[PDB]
Write a protein that binds this DNA or RNA. Structure first.
Ligand SMILES: [K+]
Ligand SMILES: [Mn+2]
Ligand SMILES: [Mn+2]
Ligand SMILES: [Mn+2]
Ligand SMILES: [Mn+2]
Ligand SMILES: [Mn+2]
Length: 136
RNA sequence: ACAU
DNA sequence: CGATGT
């Protein structure tokens, strides 16, 4: 209903899906870019959305921030709640890196705690999430 | 049918 | 038009 401006917004960007994947996190109130992941040669949109949320959790935890996180990805929000990224991407030599990062992100979720609310950014009501890459 |  | 997901 109401945007919680005191929050962190995250999003994936890609070149192809599957394709080159990156993500970033921004201050929802200002749009200041707070973190950016170096592009990963092959991944899916949903793996990147997932990595973005988990990086957000780790970012906020390290700084002792109780801000919520916004993501526009129903899939990734669920994967984080489940602590399991049910990606269909083949595991091969090409996808080894993204799968390592995903597996490690899951491992982090299974060994740490957080109270960070993970909230759905309501794109249909509010427009693109502020971390969007402006490519669509 | 909804979310990317 | 193609793909990733619940
Ligand atoms: K969107
Ligand atoms: Mn997104
Ligand atoms: Mn795993
Ligand atoms: Mn986007
Ligand atoms: Mn367009
Ligand atoms: Mn489009």
């Amino acid at each position: 209903e109401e945007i919680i401006w005191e929050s962190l917004s995250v999003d994936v960007g890609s070149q192809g899906n599957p394709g080159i994947v990156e993500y970033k996190g921004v201050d929802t109130k200002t749009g200041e870019v707070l973190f950016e992941r170096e592009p990963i040669p092959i991944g899916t949109n949903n793996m990147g959305e997932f990595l973005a949320i988990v990086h957000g959790l780790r970012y906020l935890k390290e700084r002792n921030s109780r801000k919520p996180i916004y993501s526009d990805s129903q899939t990734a929000i669920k994967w984080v709640k489940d602590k399991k990224a049910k990606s269909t991407l083949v595991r091969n030599e090409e996808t080894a890196l993204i799968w390592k990062l995903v597996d490690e992100a899951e491992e982090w979720l299974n060994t740490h705690t957080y109270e960070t609310p993970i909230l759905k950014w309501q794109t249909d009501k509010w427009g693109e999430i502020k971390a969007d890459y402006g490519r669509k």
